[PDB]
Amino acid sequence: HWGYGKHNGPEHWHKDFPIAKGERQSPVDIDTHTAKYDPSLKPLSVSYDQATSLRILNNGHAFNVEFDDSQDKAVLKGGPLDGTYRLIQFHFHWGSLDGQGSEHTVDKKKYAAELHLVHWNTKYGDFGKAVQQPDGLAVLGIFLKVGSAKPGLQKVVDVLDSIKTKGKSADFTNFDPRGLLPESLDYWTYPGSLTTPPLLECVTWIVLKEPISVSSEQVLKFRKLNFNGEGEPEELMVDNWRPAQPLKNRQIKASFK
Ligand SMILES: O=C(O)Cc1cccc([N+](=O)[O-])c1
Ligand code: NI
Ligand code: NI
Numbered sequence: 001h002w003g004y005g006k007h008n009g010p011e012h013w014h015k016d017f018p019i020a021k022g023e024r025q026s027p028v029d030i031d032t033h034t035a036k037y038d039p040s041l042k043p044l045s046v047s048y049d050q051a052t053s054l055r056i057l058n059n060g061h062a063f064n065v066e067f068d069d070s071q072d073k074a075v076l077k078g079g080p081l082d083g084t085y086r087l088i089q090f091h092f093h094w095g096s097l098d099g100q101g102s103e104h105t106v107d108k109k110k111y112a113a114e115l116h117l118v119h120w121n122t123k124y125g126d127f128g129k130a131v132q133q134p135d136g137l138a139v140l141g142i143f144l145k146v147g148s149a150k151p152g153l154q155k156v157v158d159v160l161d162s163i164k165t166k167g168k169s170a171d172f173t174n175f176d177p178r179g180l181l182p183e184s185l186d187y188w189t190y191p192g193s194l195t196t197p198p199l200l201e202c203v204t205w206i207v208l209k210e211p212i213s214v215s216s217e218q219v220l221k222f223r224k225l226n227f228n229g230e231g232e233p234e235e236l237m238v239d240n241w242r243p244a245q246p247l248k249n250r251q252i253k254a255s256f257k
Helices: 151-163 217-220
Strands: 044-047 051-056 063-067 075-078 083-096 111-120 137-148 169-170 187-192 203-208 212-214
Touching: 051 151, 063 151, 075 111, 083 137, 083 217, 137 217, 151 169, 151 217
Parallel strands: 137 203, 137 212
Antiparallel strands: 044 075, 051 063, 051 169, 063 083, 075 083, 083 111, 111 137, 187 203
């Protein structure tokens, strides 16, 4: 019964999931000066035109916007990837304050939040099988800074009062995730893991260099969510980010010079 507190937070997770101290854990600090530009990298293809969003769920640690992943409707390909990766969900990690919240850091800088678009490799048939493979998932990571509002985020923000507590869901159809992407698809990539239990080492991370801007008011609404279930004492859903982990024997590659 894990979480983000003093008593059950990241620094405890290794007792249940020894892989927490493994060789390819996430997130990491991205040292921009030491990331090497990789010309082998194939260009990134994000094909979200046919995406079908279904539902938004408060899972007790974040909220997930879930997609129909029963066909190739929203797919990621290219970049460092071999093959086709299907969108299953996106979620965010965020802070109690604007000065923290992202999982990845960039030269030690923390952003206010980070968006994760989670995709699984279709060669494995479903998500559950894909998470058991070293190349099972591709997560596209996007940093959020506080400034102007992000218009394409407002639909998400406005439904959050309907999913305040753990286990609540709401219908969330017709949401276009293209409205959450920055202009540029320049990226860093490295092999890593999920950042909550069970911490599986199944992720190719693709972290975009260009942040998106969201307003103060938008991020404030994230911070009104609750970790707890209805009828339990209120504990605000904030600081649901794992801190940077050791890079160990990994290289971070850049798609750009
Ligand atoms: O890495 C995370 O944010 C945690 C996490 C936990 C469980 C599933 C997830 N997913 O990628 O579908 C992500
Ligand atoms: Ni538990
Ligand atoms: Ni995540």
